Amino acid sequence: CSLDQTVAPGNLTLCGNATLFTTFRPKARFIAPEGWMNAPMGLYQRADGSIHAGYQSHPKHIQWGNISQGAAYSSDFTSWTDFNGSEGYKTIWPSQIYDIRGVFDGSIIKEGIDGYPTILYTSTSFGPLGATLNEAEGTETQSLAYTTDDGASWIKLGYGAGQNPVIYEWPETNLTGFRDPYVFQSPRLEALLANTTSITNATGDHFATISGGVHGDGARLFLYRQHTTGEFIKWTYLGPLVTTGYKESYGEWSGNYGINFETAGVTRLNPAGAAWDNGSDTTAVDFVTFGTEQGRADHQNHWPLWAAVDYEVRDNGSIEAVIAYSGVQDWGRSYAYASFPVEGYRQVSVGWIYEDDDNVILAKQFGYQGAFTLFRDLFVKVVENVSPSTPGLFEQASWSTKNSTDGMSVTVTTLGQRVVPETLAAYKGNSTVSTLAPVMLNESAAAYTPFSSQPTDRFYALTGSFEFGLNTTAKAGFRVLASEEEYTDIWFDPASENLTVVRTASSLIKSFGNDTELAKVKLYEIVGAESKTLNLTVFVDGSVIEIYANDEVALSTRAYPWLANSTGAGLLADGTTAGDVVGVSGLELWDGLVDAWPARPANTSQGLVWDGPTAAMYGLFAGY
Amino acid sequence: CSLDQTVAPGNLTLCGNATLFTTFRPKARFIAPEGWMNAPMGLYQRADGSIHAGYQSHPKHIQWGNISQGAAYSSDFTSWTDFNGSEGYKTIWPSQIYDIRGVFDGSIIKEGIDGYPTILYTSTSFGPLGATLNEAEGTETQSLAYTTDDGASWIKLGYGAGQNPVIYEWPETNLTGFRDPYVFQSPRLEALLANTTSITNATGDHFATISGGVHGDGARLFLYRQHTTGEFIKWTYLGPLVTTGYKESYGEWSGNYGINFETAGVTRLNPAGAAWDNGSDTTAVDFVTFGTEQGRADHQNHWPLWAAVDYEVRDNGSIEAVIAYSGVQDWGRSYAYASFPVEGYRQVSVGWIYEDDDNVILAKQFGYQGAFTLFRDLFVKVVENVSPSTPGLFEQASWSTKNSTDGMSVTVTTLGQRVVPETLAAYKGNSTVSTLAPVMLNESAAAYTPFSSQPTDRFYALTGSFEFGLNTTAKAGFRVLASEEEYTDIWFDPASENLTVVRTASSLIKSFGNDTELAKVKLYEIVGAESKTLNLTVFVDGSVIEIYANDEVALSTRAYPWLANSTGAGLLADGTTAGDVVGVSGLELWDGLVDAWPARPANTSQGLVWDGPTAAMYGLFAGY
Numbered sequence A, B: 001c002s003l004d005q006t007v008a009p010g011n012l013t014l015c016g017n018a019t020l021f022t023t024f025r026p027k028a029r030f031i032a033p034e035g036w037m038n039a040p041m042g043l044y045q046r047a048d049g050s051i052h053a054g055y056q057s058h059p060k061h062i063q064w065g066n067i068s069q070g071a072a073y074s075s076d077f078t079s080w081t082d083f084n085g086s087e088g089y090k091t092i093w094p095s096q097i098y099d100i101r102g103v104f105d106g107s108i109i110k111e112g113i114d115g116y117p118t119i120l121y122t123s124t125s126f127g128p129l130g131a132t133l134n135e136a137e138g139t140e141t142q143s144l145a146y147t148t149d150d151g152a153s154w155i156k157l158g159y160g161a162g163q164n165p166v167i168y169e170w171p172e173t174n175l176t177g178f179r180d181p182y183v184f185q186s187p188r189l190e191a192l193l194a195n196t197t198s199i200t201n202a203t204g205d206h207f208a209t210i211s212g213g214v215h216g217d218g219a220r221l222f223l224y225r226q227h228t229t230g231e232f233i234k235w236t237y238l239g240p241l242v243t244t245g246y247k248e249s250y251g252e253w254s255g256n257y258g259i260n261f262e263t264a265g266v267t268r269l270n271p272a273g274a275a276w277d278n279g280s281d282t283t284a285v286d287f288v289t290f291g292t293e294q295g296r297a298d299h300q301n302h303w304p305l306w307a308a309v310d311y312e313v314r315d316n317g318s319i320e321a322v323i324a325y326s327g328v329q330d331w332g333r334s335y336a337y338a339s340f341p342v343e344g345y346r347q348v349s350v351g352w353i354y355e356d357d358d359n360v361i362l363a364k365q366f367g368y369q370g371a372f373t374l375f376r377d378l379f380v381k382v383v384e385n386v387s388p389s390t391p392g393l394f395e396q397a398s399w400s401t402k403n404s405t406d407g408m409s410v411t412v413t414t415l416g417q418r419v420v421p422e423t424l425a426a427y428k429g430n431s432t433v434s435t436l437a438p439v440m441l442n443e444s445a446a447a448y449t450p451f452s453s454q455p456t457d458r459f460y461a462l463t464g465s466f467e468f469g470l471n472t473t474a475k476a477g478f479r480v481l482a483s484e485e486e487y488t489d490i491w492f493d494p495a496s497e498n499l500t501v502v503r504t505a506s507s508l509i510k511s512f513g514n515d516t517e518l519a520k521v522k523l524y525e526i527v528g529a530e531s532k533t534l535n536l537t538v539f540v541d542g543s544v545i546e547i548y549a550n551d552e553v554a555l556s557t558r559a560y561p562w563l564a565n566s567t568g569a570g571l572l573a574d575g576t577t578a579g580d581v582v583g584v585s586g587l588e589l590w591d592g593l594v595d596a597w598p599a600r601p602a603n604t605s606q607g608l609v610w611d612g613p614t615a616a617m618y619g620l621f622a623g624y
C-alpha cells in the first residue's frame, strides 16, 4: 500500500484499517470521530442556547449495528465538541430487552419527565425488521429516556407495564415499519382538534408522528397525541396523517413515495422561518418532511422528500394531511433529514450524507462512514411578480401559484432552504476570500476556465450568479476538485431545467460511484426581465460536494479524487456563443472554511473490530 | 381474603400479592429475599474462607424470566447475608446481545482473569431454546466475567472476536441443549490425557463440561479443556464425556436419562470427601452428577441423578466416562444440583427445591417461589461386612460390591451424602433439643403416636433409628406438620424397599400437589446381624420437608397445611405386632433450627410487577 498522491493510485484494498482516514475526510461539518454514522437524532436547543445533536452511531465498525446515539454540542451549528462519558461519545446504547437490537431514531420533548429534556425513540428487539420483510408487532416499539445533565447521559424509564416501552401496539395491521417518533407542539393542530377532544379524550400539548406504511398499500405517517398535558406515558393514536399509494409519484419534481416512510417530521413555516400560530397567519404553510424507501432505482432506494399539506379534521377526531404540492429536500446522496425548533422563530433541518462506496471496497481503509449535511434554515420561499410565460409554471408541481387580480403576474410559494447564517459567517470569516471579477461566457469561452484565485486544499466554498437568456440552449456551471486528470463538473442546463453533477472523471479510483447526479430547478422568470438567473453556492469539504440553488434546491454528493492536486475550481461553459451568452457575476471563493472539531486531532480512529462468528449466528448486524 | 388459620381456608386466590409471604416460608435455609429463584450457580469458597452462593433469580416476579444471578455469602453454610449493590441482591444480569435473553447457570474459575475469581456462564440470546424445540447455534453460548470485589460485582469481557462469548460453536449438530458450563481442575484427567496432548494441543489445568444432548439420540455431556494454562479465552472441545440413550434407564434405582442433560458436574471422591489424586488413590471414585429432562412423568419431567464412572482415553485425545453404576441424588421435588470444592478435602453439593403449585394458583399470593436444599458433603460411602443374603445385593444398581476372599462377606460402595456438619451443629445448638426415650412398636402401637415433646412451629428436625426384623412386613416412620385434620406421613416399608411421603392429607388447601413421593432405600444387612436398621433424619422448614436416610438417600418435598396447629410430629406404625416389632431409638427433636437470614425482616417482599403486553410479543418470558 502506497499513499503517494503524486502518482496513480495502486490497489488501495491492500491498505490497512484507517490508512485512508484523512485522505477524503470532511473537516468543516458535523461528523462522528470515527466509524459508522447515519441519521441525525435527538436534536434540540439546550437551555443555554447551545445545540445538542445526536446521531445513529456504530463506533469502531464501518457498517451499521448495535446502533446507538453518539452526541455533540455547539453554540453556532459550526464548531462542535464531543461528549465524553463512560461510553466515549455515545450517550444512549442498546441495554434492555426492548432496545437491545438498536436504539433507532428519536426526538426531544424539551419539558418532559420531571421537567427534563426527554427523548422518545424507537426501541428495537429481535425479529425480521424491514419494509420488505415480514415484521411482527413488538420488534419496533417506542420508549422514553430523560437527561438530568443536558445530554451527557440519559436515564431510561424502567421496563414494564405502565413504563417502557410506552408505545408498542401497531395502530393498523401488516405494517411495513413503525419507527422514528417525531414529537412536536402545534397550536395549529390543537385548534383544529379542540372541538373533537370528547371523542378521543386526548388533550395534551404534544403530538407525535410515527413513520411506516402497510404491506402492498403504500406509506403511512401515523399521528398520536399525548393523552394528558404533563404526563408522558400515555399517547393516543388518532389516525393516519399522511397516506400515499404503493410507489405513487406526484411527478418529475417530486421523487416517489415508495412503500414506507422513515424519519418523517411535521412543521409549520412562514416567509421568515417557523410559524407558531393557530392558523390565523395567512402566510404560514403546514409541511411534512419524510424519507421514502423502495421507490428509487439508485441512491440506496431512498428519497428525502417534503410536502405542503392542508389539514382536514375527520369525524373520529383525527387529522388528514392532504398533499397540496410535493418536492425533494435534497436530490443527491443524502437522507434522514430531521428538523427542530430554534429560538427566534426558526426551524432548522439537517440530514445524513452517505458515502459512495456501496460495495464496501474501501470502508475499512477509511475507518469511518458518513457525515451530516450542513444545517439549513427552513422557511416559506415566496417569489413575487413571476411572469405567466415561465415554462411549466402552472403544473404547480413542488410549488403553488396565486394569480394577481389582473392575471398579468403570479406569486410563487414553495419550501425554502438556506444554510444557517452562523455557518456562512464563520466559513467566510475563517477563509481566505477571493472576490472574483464577473465573467461573460460567449464564443471565446473555453470549456473550463480556472478561477483567477485557486483553492489550496479540499475545503472551500464557491458562489456565483449565472444570468441566462430566456431562450438559451447554453449550459454553464462550476468544475471542482479539479486537476488535468480528475475533476467533478456541476452543470445547469436551463433548456432541460436540469442541474447535473457529472462524475465520470471525479476519481482515478474506480470502485467509487460515478453516476450523474440530477436535480430539477425551476427558474421563475420575473415580469419585465429579459433574462433568468441561477444563484449557485457550492461547498467542497473533503469528499462532500454540497450544492444549493436559489435558496430552494439542494444536492449533496461525493467525489474521491486521488491526486493531491485535484483541488482546483473554475467556470464551465457549453454552447456559449456571441449570441447565446451567460453572464456570471457575484463570484466568490472562500478557501479554508472552518475547522469544525477544534479539539479533535487529525486522526481520531481507534481502530476497527470484528464481532466474531456470533454476528452471523444472531443475524442482526454485519459484524464489522 | 381471610388469613384466619384457626378455621378452614377460604378462597385464597382472592388474597392480594404477597399476603401469604410468611405463611409457608422456610426460615432456616438459603432462599432469595423475594420473587422467583431456581438453580444454584457461581458457587465458590472465597479467599477469606466464606462461601459465595449465586442463584438463578427473577425479583418481583413469580415465574422465570430475565434470569440473573442473585447472590449472598456465609461463613458456615447456615447464616447468610445478601449482597446489596446498584441492582439490589443481583450481581449479574442480562445486558449484552449475547446474554440479553438470560444469564443462565455458570461456575467459578477461582484463579481466572488477572488472577480474579471468574465465572464461565451460559449467555443466551434470541430464538427457540429447549430440548423439545428446534434450537439453533448462537442462542446458547458461554461467556466470562470476573470479580475484583469478591462477588459484589462482576465485569464481563467485551463482546466480539477473541472476547465474549468464548464458546459458541456447537461441537456436534442438532443439539437439544448447550449450557451450564462446569469448570474444574483434575489431576486425574490431566494424567490420563498427558500422552495425547500432541493430538489436541490442549494443555491447560482447567476442564469444562457443557450439558446437552442430540435430537432423537439421547443426552450428552461435552468435555472441553482449557487450551493453555493461565489463558481463559480458548477452550478446546475434546469429545463427549457421557453419552446416554434416548430415554434410557439403568433401572428402578437409577431414574431415567431422558433426552438432555442440565447442570452436570464432574468430581472425584474418596471415603473422607474430595479426592485430588491422579488415579493413585485406589479408594477414590470418579463421579458425574447431572439433571435429565423428559424422562419422567411428573416432578416437572426432571431427574437429579449421579453416576460412578470409569474413564477411558480415546485415540483422538478425549475421554469416555463409562458408567459403572448410577443413582439418584434426590428423589423428590428438587433439581439443579451444583457441587464445589471446599477446604479440608470436601466437595459440597446443593440443589433447588421447587414449590408444589405447578398450576401457579397461589404463587402471586406467596410473593416468591423456590428455595435451596441444605448443603451436603459428598463422599464415597463404604459399608463393610455386608451379608451376601441381602436381597437384590448383586444387581449392583446404584452401588458396587466387592466380595471378600472367602466369599462370606461383601464390601458395598456408593455415593454418600450428608448435611454439612456446620449446619447440623448450628441447628442443634440454636434449637430446644428434646432427647426422647426409645419406643418399641408392637401390637400396642397406635397408627400415630405423638412424640412426648412437640414442635412449637414449622421449623424443626427429627432423627431416629428404626430397627426392623430381617423378614419384617411392618412399616414405620414419622408423621410431621400434623394436627387432627392435616398431616404428612413419611413411611419406610422394608418389604418393598420403598420410602414414601404420603401427602393426601398434607393440606386443606386443595390446589397444592398431593402425590405420593417415593425413594428406594437398600438396607445393607450386616454379617451376623438379626436385624436391619434405617437411620432417618427429617428437616421441616416452613413448607420444605427434607429427608435423609443412612447418609445416602435424600428426598425433598413440600407440604402446605393451612391450620396454625398443623405443626405436630410423632411415630408411625403399620402392621407392628407382638412378633413383628420395630424398635425405635436415638430419637431426638430439635425445635427452632436457625434464623438463616438474620438481617432480613420477616417480610422482604417488594411487591410484584407485570412486564406488560410486550412480554407476549417477545415471547421469551411469562411476564409476571
Ligand SMILES: *[C@@H]1O[C@H](CO)[C@@H](O[C@@H]2O[C@H](CO)[C@@H](O[C@@H]3O[C@H](CO[C@H]4O[C@H](CO[C@H]5O[C@H](CO)[C@@H](O)[C@H](O)[C@@H]5O[C@H]5O[C@H](CO)[C@@H](O)[C@H](O)[C@@H]5O)[C@@H](O)[C@H](O[C@H]5O[C@H](CO)[C@@H](O)[C@H](O)[C@@H]5O)[C@@H]4O)[C@@H](O)[C@H](O[C@H]4O[C@H](CO)[C@@H](O)[C@H](O)[C@@H]4O[C@H]4O[C@H](CO)[C@@H](O)[C@H](O)[C@@H]4O[C@H]4O[C@H](CO)[C@@H](O)[C@H](O)[C@@H]4O)[C@@H]3O)[C@H](O)[C@H]2NC(C)=O)[C@H](O)[C@H]1NC(C)=O
Pocket: A092, A093, A095, A096, A097, A113, A114, A154, A155, A156, A157, A158, A159, B066, B068, B085, B086, B087, B090, B093, B094, B095
Ligand atoms: C433485567 O434486569 C435488569 C437488572 O436488574 C433490569 O435493568 C434494571 O432495571 C431497573 C428497574 O427499571 C433499573 O432501575 C432504575 O434505575 C434508575 C436509575 O438508572 C440510572 O442509574 C442507575 C444506578 O446508578 C448508580 O449505580 C451505577 C452502577 O454502579 C453507577 O455507575 C452510578 O454512578 C450510580 O451509582 C451510585 O448509586 C449506587 C446505588 O444505586 C451506589 O452503589 C454508588 O456508590 C453510587 O452512589 C444505573 O445503573 C443506570 O444505568 C443503566 O441504565 C442506563 C439507561 O438508563 C444505561 O445507559 C446503562 O448502561 C445501565 O444499563 C442509570 O444510569 C432509577 O431512576 C429508577 O428509580 C426509580 O424508578 C423506580 C421505578 O419507578 C422507582 O421505584 C424509584 O423510586 C425511582 O423513581 C423515582 O425517581 C425518579 C427520578 O429520579 C422519578 O421520575 C420518579 O417519579 C420517582 O420519584 C419518587 O421520588 C421522589 C423523591 O426522590 C418523589 O418526589 C416522587 O414523588 C416519587 O415518589 C430505577 O431504580 C436499572 O437501572 C436497570 N439496570 C440495568 C443495569 O439495566 C432490566 O430492566 C431487566 N429486564 C427485564 C426484561 O426485566
Ligand SMILES: *[C@@H]1O[C@H](CO)[C@@H](O[C@@H]2O[C@H](CO)[C@@H](O[C@@H]3O[C@H](CO[C@H]4O[C@H](CO[C@H]5O[C@H](CO)[C@@H](O)[C@H](O)[C@@H]5O[C@H]5O[C@H](CO)[C@@H](O)[C@H](O)[C@@H]5O)[C@@H](O)[C@H](O[C@H]5O[C@H](CO)[C@@H](O)[C@H](O)[C@@H]5O)[C@@H]4O)[C@@H](O)[C@H](O[C@H]4O[C@H](CO)[C@@H](O)[C@H](O)[C@@H]4O[C@H]4O[C@H](CO)[C@@H](O)[C@H](O)[C@@H]4O[C@H]4O[C@H](CO)[C@@H](O)[C@H](O)[C@@H]4O)[C@@H]3O)[C@H](O)[C@H]2NC(C)=O)[C@H](O)[C@H]1NC(C)=O
Pocket: A066, A068, A085, A086, A087, A090, A093, A094, A095, B092, B093, B095, B096, B097, B113, B114, B154, B155, B156, B157, B158, B159
Ligand atoms: C453496544 O454498545 C454498548 C455500549 O457501548 C457495548 O457495551 C459496552 O462494551 C464496552 C467494550 O466491551 C465495555 O467497555 C469495557 O468496560 C470494562 C469496564 O466495565 C465496567 O465498568 C464500566 C465503566 O465503569 C464506570 O462508569 C460507570 C457508568 O457511569 C459507573 O457506574 C462506574 O462506577 C465507573 O465510573 C467511573 O469511570 C467512569 C469512566 O469510565 C467515570 O465517568 C466515572 O466518573 C467513574 O470514575 C461499566 O459501565 C460497566 O458496566 C456495564 O457492564 C457490566 C458488566 O460488565 C453490567 O453489569 C452493567 O450493567 C453495565 O452494562 C462495568 O461495570 C473495561 O474493563 C473494559 O476495558 C478494558 O478492556 C478493553 C478491551 O479489551 C481494553 O481496551 C481496556 O484497556 C481494558 O482492558 C485492560 O484492563 C483489564 C483489567 O481492568 C485487563 O484485563 C486487560 O488485559 C487490559 O489491561 C491493560 O492495562 C493494564 C494496565 O492498566 C496492563 O497491565 C495490561 O498489560 C493491559 O495493557 C472496556 O472498557 C462497556 O462496559 C460496555 N457498556 C455497557 C453499558 O454495556 C456493547 O458491547 C455493544 N454491543 C454490541 C453487540 O456491539
Ligand SMILES: *[C@@H]1O[C@H](CO)[C@@H](O[C@@H]2O[C@H](CO)[C@@H](O[C@@H]3O[C@H](CO[C@H]4O[C@H](CO)[C@@H](O)[C@H](O[C@H]5O[C@H](CO)[C@@H](O)[C@H](O)[C@@H]5O)[C@@H]4O)[C@@H](O)[C@H](O[C@H]4O[C@H](CO)[C@@H](O)[C@H](O)[C@@H]4O[C@H]4O[C@H](CO)[C@@H](O)[C@H](O)[C@@H]4O)[C@@H]3O)[C@H](O)[C@H]2NC(C)=O)[C@H](O)[C@H]1NC(C)=O
Pocket: A161, A162, A163, B017, B364, B607, B608, B609, B610, B612, B613, B624
Ligand atoms: C400484583 O402483582 C401483579 C404482577 O403479577 C401486578 O400487575 C398485574 O399483573 C397481572 C399479571 O399477574 C396483570 O394481569 C394481566 O392483565 C392483562 C390486561 O391488563 C389490562 O387491564 C388491567 C385491568 O383493568 C389493567 O390493570 C392493565 O393496566 C396496566 O397495564 C397497562 C399496560 O397494558 C399500563 O399502561 C397500566 O398503567 C397498568 O400498569 C391493562 O390495561 C391481561 O390481558 C392478562 O391476561 C391474561 O391474564 C390472565 C392469566 O391468568 C387470563 O385471565 C387471561 O386469559 C390472559 O391469560 C393468558 O394466559 C396465557 C399465559 O399468559 C396466554 O397464553 C393466554 O393467551 C392468555 O393471554 C393478565 O390478566 C395486570 O394487568 C397487572 N396490573 C397492573 C400492572 O396494574 C399488580 O399490580 C400487583 N398488585 C398490586 C396491588 O400491587
Ligand SMILES: *[C@@H]1O[C@H](CO)[C@@H](O[C@@H]2O[C@H](CO)[C@@H](O[C@@H]3O[C@H](CO[C@H]4O[C@H](CO)[C@@H](O)[C@H](O[C@H]5O[C@H](CO)[C@@H](O)[C@H](O)[C@@H]5O)[C@@H]4O)[C@@H](O)[C@H](O[C@H]4O[C@H](CO)[C@@H](O)[C@H](O)[C@@H]4O[C@H]4O[C@H](CO)[C@@H](O)[C@H](O)[C@@H]4O)[C@@H]3O)[C@H](O)[C@H]2NC(C)=O)[C@H](O)[C@H]1NC(C)=O
Pocket: A017, A364, A607, A608, A609, A610, A612, A613, A624, B161, B162, B163
Ligand atoms: C482491521 O479491522 C478488522 C475489523 O473489520 C479487524 O478484525 C478483522 O475483521 C475482519 C472483518 O472485517 C475479519 O474477517 C473475517 O474473518 C473470518 C475468519 O476469521 C478467522 O480467520 C482469521 C484469519 O486467520 C483470524 O484472524 C480470525 O481470528 C480472530 O477471530 C477469532 C474468532 O473466530 C478469535 O478467536 C481470534 O482471536 C481473532 O480475533 C478467525 O480465526 C472470515 O470467516 C470472514 O468471512 C467472510 O469474510 C469475507 C467477507 O468479505 C469473505 O472473503 C468470506 O467469503 C466471508 O464472506 C462473507 O460475506 C457475506 C457477508 O458477511 C456472507 O453472507 C458470506 O456467507 C461470507 O461469510 C471474514 O474474512 C477478521 O477475522 C478480523 N480479524 C481479527 C479479529 O483479528 C482487524 O483485526 C483489523 N486489523 C488490525 C491490524 O487492527
Ligand SMILES: OC[C@H]1O[C@@](CO)(OC[C@H]2O[C@H](O[C@H]3[C@H](O)[C@@H](O)[C@@H](O)O[C@@H]3CO)[C@H](O)[C@@H](O)[C@@H]2O)[C@@H](O)[C@@H]1O
Pocket: A038, A039, A056, A064, A067, A104, A105, A122, A129, A130, A131, A179, A180, A262, A263, A335, A336, A620, A621, A622
Ligand atoms: O439506524 C436506523 C435508523 O435509520 C433509518 C433511516 O435510514 O433506518 C435505516 C434502516 O435501519 C435498519 O436496517 C439495517 C438492517 O437491519 C441491517 O441488516 C443492515 O442491512 O443495515 C441496515 C441499515 O443500513 C432497519 O432494519 C431498516 O428497516 C431501516 O431502513 C431510520 O428509519 C432508523 O431509525
Ligand SMILES: OC[C@H]1O[C@@](CO)(OC[C@H]2O[C@H](O[C@H]3[C@H](O)[C@@H](O)[C@@H](O)O[C@@H]3CO)[C@H](O)[C@@H](O)[C@@H]2O)[C@@H](O)[C@@H]1O
Pocket: B038, B039, B056, B064, B067, B104, B105, B122, B129, B130, B131, B179, B180, B262, B263, B335, B336, B620, B621, B622
Ligand atoms: O434458569 C435457567 C437454568 O435452569 C436450568 C435447569 O433447570 O434450565 C431451566 C430451563 O430454562 C429455560 O426455560 C424457561 C423457558 O424458556 C420459559 O419459556 C419458561 O417456560 O420458563 C422456563 C424455565 O422454567 C430454558 O428455555 C429451558 O430449556 C431449560 O430447561 C439450567 O439448565 C439453566 O441454566
Ligand SMILES: *[C@@H]1O[C@H](CO)[C@@H](O)[C@H](O)[C@H]1NC(C)=O
Pocket: A005, A006, A007, A483, A484, A485, A563, A565, A566
Ligand atoms: C497534478 O499531479 C499529476 C501527478 O503528479 C501531474 O501529472 C500533473 O501535471 C499535476 N499538475 C496539474 C494537473 O496541474
Ligand SMILES: *[C@@H]1O[C@H](CO)[C@@H](O)[C@H](O)[C@H]1NC(C)=O
Pocket: A011, A013, A014
Ligand atoms: C487488489 O488486492 C486484492 C487483495 O486485497 C486482490 O484480491 C485483487 O485481485 C487486487 N486487484 C488487482 C491486482 O487488480
Ligand SMILES: *[C@@H]1O[C@H](CO)[C@@H](O)[C@H](O)[C@H]1NC(C)=O
Pocket: A237, A238, A239, A240, A314, A316, A318
Ligand atoms: C379514524 O378514521 C380514520 C379514517 O377512517 C382511520 O384510518 C383511523 O384508524 C381512525 N382512528 C381510530 C383511532 O380508529
Ligand SMILES: *[C@@H]1O[C@H](CO)[C@@H](O)[C@H](O)[C@H]1NC(C)=O
Pocket: A388, A403, A407, A408
Ligand atoms: C392564472 O393566470 C393565467 C395567465 O393569466 C391564466 O391562464 C389562468 O386561467 C389564471 N387562473 C385563474 C384561476 O384565474
Ligand SMILES: *[C@@H]1O[C@H](CO)[C@@H](O)[C@H](O)[C@H]1NC(C)=O
Pocket: A076, A078, A079, A425, A426, A427, A428, A429, A430, A594
Ligand atoms: C471562525 O469560526 C468560528 C467557529 O464557528 C467562529 O466562532 C468565528 O466567529 C469565525 N471567525 C471569524 C468570522 O472571523
Ligand SMILES: *[C@@H]1O[C@H](CO)[C@@H](O)[C@H](O)[C@H]1NC(C)=O
Pocket: A252, A493, A496, A497, A498, A518, A520
Ligand atoms: C432532464 O432530466 C429529466 C429527468 O427529470 C430527463 O428525463 C431528461 O432526459 C433530462 N434532459 C436533459 C437534456 O438532460
Ligand SMILES: *[C@@H]1O[C@H](CO)[C@@H](O)[C@H](O)[C@H]1NC(C)=O
Pocket: B005, B006, B007, B483, B484, B485, B563, B565, B566
Ligand atoms: C387445631 O385447630 C383446629 C381448628 O382451629 C381445631 O379444630 C383443633 O381442635 C385444633 N387442635 C388440635 C388438632 O389438636
Ligand SMILES: *[C@@H]1O[C@H](CO)[C@@H](O)[C@H](O)[C@H]1NC(C)=O
Pocket: B011, B013, B014
Ligand atoms: C375463587 O375466586 C376466584 C377469583 O379469584 C373465582 O374465579 C373462583 O370461582 C373462586 N372459587 C370458588 C368460589 O370456589
Ligand SMILES: *[C@@H]1O[C@H](CO)[C@@H](O)[C@H](O)[C@H]1NC(C)=O
Pocket: B237, B238, B239, B240, B314, B316, B318
Ligand atoms: C473424538 O472421538 C469421539 C468418538 O468418535 C467423537 O465423538 C469426538 O467428536 C471426537 N473429537 C473431536 C474433537 O473430533
Ligand SMILES: *[C@@H]1O[C@H](CO)[C@@H](O)[C@H](O)[C@H]1NC(C)=O
Pocket: B388, B403, B407, B408
Ligand atoms: C460373590 O459372592 C457371592 C456369594 O458368595 C457369589 O455368589 C458370587 O459368585 C461371588 N462373586 C465372585 C466374583 O466371586
